[PDB]
């Protein structure tokens, strides 16, 4: 399984996860790709702001799904 994560600036990241990864665990992968700290960022799917303790399965996330990330300080 993989997923993708898209900034508010417009960059698309790609990550390797399982349906059992948490939202926290997903944020923590982007820190390998751009260095963005997982306490500064949040995630969005179907316009809804996702909760840190939930899974990818909790939002019915699929392989190659195209999610977004949101920094609490904007960063752009």
């Amino acid at each position: 399984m993989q997923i993708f994560v898209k900034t508010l600036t417009g960059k698309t990241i790609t990550l390797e996860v399982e349906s059992s990864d948490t939202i926290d665990n997903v944020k923590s992968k982007i820190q390998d790709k751009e260095g963005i700290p997982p306490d500064q960022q949040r995630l969005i799917f179907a316009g809804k702001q996702l909760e840190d303790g939930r899974t990818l399965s909790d939002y019915n996330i699929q392989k190659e799904s195209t999610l977004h990330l949101v920094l609490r300080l904007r960063g752009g």
Binding site: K6, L8, G10, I44, F45, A46, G47, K48, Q49, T66, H68, V70, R74
Partner: protein, 58 residues
Amino acid sequence: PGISGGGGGILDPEERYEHQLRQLNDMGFFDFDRNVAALRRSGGSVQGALDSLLNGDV
């Protein structure tokens, strides 16, 4: 009363904010009219519009 101001075709929100409109759509908000009404009050912030869209302010 006393809202809005001057402008022209080159300044309408459909092209003033076309990046942010796409970013809202790509996150999940295909309601163009709501996105426009939200960007108009957020000041053109993607997440500022997103907060209004979530709260039902548009």
